[PDB]
Design an enzyme around this catalytic site. Structure first.
Site, PDB file in Angstrom:
ATOM      1  N   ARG A  46      -8.572  -6.502  -9.138  1.00 58.90           N
ATOM      2  CA  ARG A  46      -9.002  -6.700  -7.779  1.00 58.90           C
ATOM      3  C   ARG A  46      -9.978  -5.507  -7.213  1.00 58.90           C
ATOM      4  O   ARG A  46      -9.743  -4.272  -7.730  1.00 58.90           O
ATOM      5  CB  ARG A  46      -7.895  -6.722  -6.676  1.00 58.90           C
ATOM      6  CG  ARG A  46      -8.038  -6.717  -5.416  1.00 58.90           C
ATOM      7  CD  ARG A  46      -6.708  -6.639  -4.481  1.00 58.90           C
ATOM      8  NE  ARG A  46      -6.691  -6.552  -3.085  1.00 58.90           N
ATOM      9  CZ  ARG A  46      -6.004  -6.918  -2.328  1.00 58.90           C
ATOM     10  NH1 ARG A  46      -4.818  -7.474  -2.701  1.00 58.90           N
ATOM     11  NH2 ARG A  46      -6.077  -6.481  -0.966  1.00 58.90           N
ATOM     12  N   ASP A  82       4.446  -3.764   4.406  1.00 63.75           N
ATOM     13  CA  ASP A  82       4.141  -3.191   3.267  1.00 63.75           C
ATOM     14  C   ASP A  82       4.931  -1.602   3.053  1.00 63.75           C
ATOM     15  O   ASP A  82       5.524  -1.154   4.044  1.00 63.75           O
ATOM     16  CB  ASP A  82       2.700  -2.687   3.326  1.00 63.75           C
ATOM     17  CG  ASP A  82       1.745  -3.811   2.592  1.00 63.75           C
ATOM     18  OD1 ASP A  82       2.638  -4.787   2.026  1.00 63.75           O
ATOM     19  OD2 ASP A  82       0.482  -3.571   2.963  1.00 63.75           O
ATOM     20  N   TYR A  95      -0.812 -14.275  -3.216  1.00 68.44           N
ATOM     21  CA  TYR A  95      -0.536 -13.620  -4.554  1.00 68.44           C
ATOM     22  C   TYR A  95       0.175 -14.761  -5.389  1.00 68.44           C
ATOM     23  O   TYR A  95       0.897 -15.460  -4.782  1.00 68.44           O
ATOM     24  CB  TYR A  95       0.265 -12.214  -4.473  1.00 68.44           C
ATOM     25  CG  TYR A  95      -0.205 -11.185  -3.977  1.00 68.44           C
ATOM     26  CD1 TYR A  95      -1.322 -11.267  -3.096  1.00 68.44           C
ATOM     27  CD2 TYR A  95       0.252  -9.837  -4.374  1.00 68.44           C
ATOM     28  CE1 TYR A  95      -1.845 -10.207  -2.654  1.00 68.44           C
ATOM     29  CE2 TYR A  95      -0.516  -8.772  -3.749  1.00 68.44           C
ATOM     30  CZ  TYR A  95      -1.611  -8.875  -3.083  1.00 68.44           C
ATOM     31  OH  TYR A  95      -1.957  -7.609  -2.539  1.00 68.44           O
ATOM     32  N   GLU A 120      -5.063  -3.797  -7.816  1.00 66.91           N
ATOM     33  CA  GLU A 120      -4.460  -4.891  -8.349  1.00 66.91           C
ATOM     34  C   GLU A 120      -4.827  -5.664  -9.596  1.00 66.91           C
ATOM     35  O   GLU A 120      -5.791  -6.362  -9.506  1.00 66.91           O
ATOM     36  CB  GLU A 120      -3.928  -5.875  -7.678  1.00 66.91           C
ATOM     37  CG  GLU A 120      -3.226  -5.017  -6.326  1.00 66.91           C
ATOM     38  CD  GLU A 120      -2.965  -6.268  -5.236  1.00 66.91           C
ATOM     39  OE1 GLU A 120      -3.583  -7.168  -5.017  1.00 66.91           O
ATOM     40  OE2 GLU A 120      -1.829  -5.790  -4.412  1.00 66.91           O
ATOM     41  N   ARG A 133       7.707 -10.457  -0.158  1.00 63.67           N
ATOM     42  CA  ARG A 133       6.378 -10.601  -1.006  1.00 63.67           C
ATOM     43  C   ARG A 133       6.138 -10.109  -2.433  1.00 63.67           C
ATOM     44  O   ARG A 133       7.348  -9.288  -2.918  1.00 63.67           O
ATOM     45  CB  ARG A 133       5.350  -9.945  -0.053  1.00 63.67           C
ATOM     46  CG  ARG A 133       4.896 -10.677   1.277  1.00 63.67           C
ATOM     47  CD  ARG A 133       3.455 -10.251   1.896  1.00 63.67           C
ATOM     48  NE  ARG A 133       2.657 -10.634   0.623  1.00 63.67           N
ATOM     49  CZ  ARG A 133       1.418 -10.078   0.777  1.00 63.67           C
ATOM     50  NH1 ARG A 133       1.015  -9.015   1.532  1.00 63.67           N
ATOM     51  NH2 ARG A 133       0.413 -10.677  -0.055  1.00 63.67           N
TER      52      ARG A 133
HETATM   53  C1  LIG Z   1       0.825  -0.604  -2.376  1.00 67.83           C
HETATM   54  C2  LIG Z   1       0.498  -1.771  -1.408  1.00 67.83           C
HETATM   55  O1  LIG Z   1       0.754  -1.588  -0.043  1.00 67.83           O
HETATM   56  N1  LIG Z   1      -0.207  -2.804  -1.727  1.00 67.83           N
HETATM   57  C3  LIG Z   1      -0.634  -3.781  -0.750  1.00 67.83           C
HETATM   58  C4  LIG Z   1      -2.040  -4.132  -0.919  1.00 67.83           C
HETATM   59  C5  LIG Z   1      -3.327  -3.025  -0.742  1.00 67.83           C
HETATM   60  O2  LIG Z   1      -2.987  -2.819   0.645  1.00 67.83           O
HETATM   61  C6  LIG Z   1      -4.604  -3.280  -1.023  1.00 67.83           C
HETATM   62  O3  LIG Z   1      -4.644  -3.543  -2.213  1.00 67.83           O
HETATM   63  C7  LIG Z   1      -5.557  -2.333  -0.677  1.00 67.83           C
HETATM   64  O4  LIG Z   1      -5.598  -1.200  -1.467  1.00 67.83           O
HETATM   65  O5  LIG Z   1      -2.766  -5.279  -0.558  1.00 67.83           O
HETATM   66  C8  LIG Z   1      -1.695  -6.032   0.162  1.00 67.83           C
HETATM   67  C9  LIG Z   1      -2.416  -7.673   0.442  1.00 67.83           C
HETATM   68  O6  LIG Z   1      -1.862  -8.598   0.545  1.00 67.83           O
HETATM   69  O7  LIG Z   1      -3.615  -7.747   0.337  1.00 67.83           O
HETATM   70  C10 LIG Z   1      -0.373  -6.353  -0.473  1.00 67.83           C
HETATM   71  C11 LIG Z   1       0.084  -5.034  -1.293  1.00 67.83           C
HETATM   72  N2  LIG Z   1       1.433  -4.850  -0.698  1.00 67.83           N
HETATM   73  C12 LIG Z   1       2.636  -4.435  -1.454  1.00 67.83           C
HETATM   74  N3  LIG Z   1       2.123  -4.337  -2.916  1.00 67.83           N
HETATM   75  N4  LIG Z   1       3.619  -4.318  -1.019  1.00 67.83           N
END
Ligand SMILES: CC(=O)N[C@H]1[C@H]([C@H](O)[C@H](O)CO)OC(C(=O)O)=C[C@@H]1NC(=N)N
Ligand SMILES: [Ca+2]
Ligand code: NA
Ligand code: NA
Length: 755
Positions: A611, A226, A716, A595, A200
């Site tokens: 975001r 994650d 994404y 994000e 991802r």
């Molecule tokens: C660092 C991390 O774990 N980031 C998450 C992100 C996050 O949980 C949300 O923004 C809540 O703060 O959302 C999720 C998502 O698909 O909503 C993907 C991201 N996954 C990765 N980047 N691997």
């Protein structure tokens, strides 16, 4: 995937049969290779019969074309007659343009399922070479648009029923004579998978110095989760294209070489293309394998950090990862005197008849009433530090009338500074030094107190200060020594509580304090290299910058991480300004930007879109799942753009998700912004479905669109300019499969102009 015929006299590919096309002639229909003027062409002679070439596609290929789009490009000249039919049929439907010379000798086009001809060219131009393009956009009601030498001729062309199944070009009629010469035919199916789910979090950049070179990134997720999940190991993976994003080399694991004992997860690959060196520098987060950003499980004593790898475009070589954590991950004791005051004090035994010195290493994050104080039994000396209305760093001294502007350059304003008070017993006065520089001398004011004190001193004046060091020295001995830089990163069996370390805590109202930061994270998307910073004071062209996610302890926000020396050394900017309110429970109501993606506007201002995670409502105001911010100083500080949130993107999904924003510059000098995000299904609802494309022609004040790019799953995404006419998109789709779209931006934008 691309399917083409390219006319060439090269004996190795000197006919369509040699390039995998099937001959489909009837009767006297024929064809021959011609060399009119150095430029080879296949002459389709459809006189007294049909003369065309076909390419067959599988069921899967047709289905992919339907879901993610397709485009057909022909370079040909019509010599005579009509039924010049270059088109695609998928077994159930086709879009069929019919090109001909009419009875006036003019070049015209008709479309099956429509009445009417359109004149494309007259006179000598009617029988010359032209570029003909058909672009199909997916959706519940999908349609095609037709372009002639780059100009939109007909939009919203409805597919019509056909049992035919092939890509076709030539003269598709036995009865109608037609003659045309072809230099090139291209049929592209959009949406090839480049990274497979459950990997991802895609990002992508392209090289402007070496056209055709494209580098994409994602998280390799073993176990499909994650970062932060024990006994699972995520790494950063990359692939490079050298033909404009059509074919891709072997998936390369960038981080496993620094993950040899399976102790880490890596996440959020954030690449930046630097044209000066012609390199891609990609930054990414490191996490301990068993604690990360989600659930705030990451703590400052754990090995979260940021690393980067460099791709040399010219040689195609990857440089080993480099750690920059100490430069970008602050360690400090943080006091947010927001709606309250919080001071730490300890009684001391200073002798005012002997010299003494105090050193405090302090960063002012915002506001005022931020103090460092020493009293020695005879006099009290207090320095009050603030950020004024214009963003300067200001000191006021007790007993002294005029404020002192310590710094006005915004980067230096929010940096840590070394404050030193040198008391002279001889003079009974104290000299203030900042960063080694003598500032002024003052006598403070008479006092019988004997102590050192620091913090935010007024419940009616908001201020946040971060402290790395507080020292008090006399006769060569440190009477007080508090090293928060050290303490912040110690494991929890080490005592860190100031009140258990001989300090007294004095607090009014509501405040928040903590050792931080818990983590930093580059976040998903690409960063940028700045080139319009000439008139931006304090900034510099060539700056590498991305909007990173910082978790102080329990709250996310965004700050710039940037380098002014090609990526060798990195610095951090201020976090986004956000509203706050204390709930009755002494719990903080605020926003958490996470994000984020940024783009450099024409005037050098930076536009940031973020975001907004978790709570979106502050003091009764809903800020939506997305909010835009502006920087006027090269990304050091930001301001929240009021009423510029998810509302400006018509029919954007209402669910939180990563987006992408990027600059697009045309060859005539004009430029505009592109933005991608799911629309939801139906559009404007909550759902990671149907990726949309929005345009801004006025530097981010308003947005046009969306043009739907994808039918089905869309999460994404990242968009980047590929060349003067196209942008490349990478997008998570079914089961998070990451797919490549190559979008004719200069063609598509014409769907948005006057008709
Ligand atoms: C660092 C991390 O774990 N980031 C998450 C992100 C996050 O949980 C949300 O923004 C809540 O703060 O959302 C999720 C998502 O698909 O909503 C993907 C991201 N996954 C990765 N980047 N691997
Ligand atoms: Ca993004
Ligand atoms: Na014919
Ligand atoms: Na893990």
């Amino acid at each position: 995937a691309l399917f083409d015929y390219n006319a060439t006299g090269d004996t190795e590919f000197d006919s369509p049969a040699k390039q995998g096309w099937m001959q489909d002639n009837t009767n006297n229909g024929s064809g021959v290779l011609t060399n009119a003027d150095g430029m080879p062409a296949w002459l389709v002679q459809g006189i007294g019969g049909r003369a065309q070439w076909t390419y067959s596609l599988s069921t899967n290929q047709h289905a992919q074309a339907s879901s993610f789009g397709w485009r057909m490009t022909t370079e040909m000249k019509v010599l005579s007659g009509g039924m010049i039919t270059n088109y695609y049929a998928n077994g159930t439907q086709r879009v069929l343009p019919i090109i001909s010379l009419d009875s006036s000798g003019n070049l015209v086009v008709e479309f099956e399922g429509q009445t009417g001809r359109t004149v494309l060219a007259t006179g000598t131009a009617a029988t010359e070479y032209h570029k003909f393009e058909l672009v199909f956009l997916p959706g519940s009601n999908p349609s095609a648009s037709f372009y002639f030498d780059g100009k939109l001729i007909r939009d919203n062309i409805q597919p019509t029923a056909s049992k035919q199944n092939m890509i076709v070009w030539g003269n598709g009629s036995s009865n109608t004579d037609g003659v045309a010469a072809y230099r090139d035919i291209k049929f592209e199916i959009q949406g090839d998978v480049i990274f497979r789910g459950p990997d991802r979090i895609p990002s992508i950049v392209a090289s402007s110095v070496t056209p055709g070179v494209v580098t994409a990134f994602a998280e390799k997720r073993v176990g499909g989760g994650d970062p932060g999940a024990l006994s699972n190991t995520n790494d950063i993976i990359t692939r490079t294209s050298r033909d404009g994003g059509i074919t891709w080399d072997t998936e390369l694991n960038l981080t496993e070489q620094i993950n040899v004992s399976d102790e880490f997860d890596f996440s959020d690959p954030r690449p930046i293309y630097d044209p000066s060196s012609n390199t891609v520098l990609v930054s990414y987060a490191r996490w301990p394998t068993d604690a990360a950003q989600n659930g705030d499980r990451i703590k400052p004593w754990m090995p979260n950090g940021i690393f980067y790898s460099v791709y040399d475009v010219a040689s195609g070589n990857w440089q080993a990862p480099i750690d920059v954590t100490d430069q970008v991950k602050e360690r400090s004791f943080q006091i947010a005197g927001w709606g309250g005051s919080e001071l730490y004090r300890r009684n001391t035994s200073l002798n005012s008849q002997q010299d003494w010195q105090s050193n405090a290493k302090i960063r002012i994050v915002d506001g005022a009433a931020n103090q460092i104080q020493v009293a020695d039994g005879s006099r009290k000396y207090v320095v009050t530090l603030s950020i004024d209305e214009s963003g300067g760093l200001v000191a006021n001294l007790n007993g002294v009338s005029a404020p002192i502007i310590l710094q006005s350059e915004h980067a230096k304003v929010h940096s840590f500074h070394d404050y030193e008070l040198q008391y002279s017993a001889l003079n009974h006065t104290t000299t203030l030094f900042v960063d080694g520089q003598q500032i002024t001398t003052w006598a403070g004011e008479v006092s019988q107190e004997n102590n050192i004190q620091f913090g935010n001193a007024d419940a009616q004046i908001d201020g946040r200060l971060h402290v790395q060091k507080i020292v008090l020295t006399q006769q060569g001995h440190n009477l007080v020594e508090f090293d928060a830089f050290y303490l912040a990163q110690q494991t929890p069996e080490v005592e860190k509580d100031l009140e258990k370390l001989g300090w007294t805590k004095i607090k009014t109202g509501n405040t928040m304090s903590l050792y931080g930061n818990a983590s930093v994270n580059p976040g998903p998307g690409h960063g940028i290299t700045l080139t319009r910073q000439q008139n931006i004071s304090g900034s510099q062209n060539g700056r590498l910058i991305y909007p990173a996610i910082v978790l102080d302890r329990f709250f996310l926000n965004v700050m710039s991480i940037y380098s002014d020396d090609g990526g060798s050394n990195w610095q951090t900017g201020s976090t986004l300004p956000i509203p706050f309110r204390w709930k009755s429970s002494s719990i903080l109501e605020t926003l958490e930007p996470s994000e984020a993606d940024m783009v450099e506007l024409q005037n050098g201002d930076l536009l940031l879109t973020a975001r907004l995670d978790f709570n979106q409502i502050v003091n009764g105001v809903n800020y939506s799942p997305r909010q835009q911010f502006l920087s006027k100083d090269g990304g050091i500080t930001w301001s929240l753009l009021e009423a510029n949130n998810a509302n400006v993107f018509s029919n954007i999904s209402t669910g939180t998700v990563d987006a992408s924003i990027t600059r697009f510059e045309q060859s005539d000098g004009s430029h505009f912004l592109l933005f991608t995000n799911p629309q939801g299904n139906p559009a404007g609802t909550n759902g990671r479905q149907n990726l949309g494309l929005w345009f801004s022609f006025d530097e981010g004040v308003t947005w046009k669109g969306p043009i739907q790019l994808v039918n089905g799953a869309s999460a994404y995404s990242d968009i980047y300019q590929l060349d003067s006419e196209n942008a490349i998109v990478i997008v998570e789709t079914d089961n998070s499969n990451m797919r490549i779209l190559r979008m004719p931006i200069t063609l598509l934008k014409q769907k948005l102009t006057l008709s």
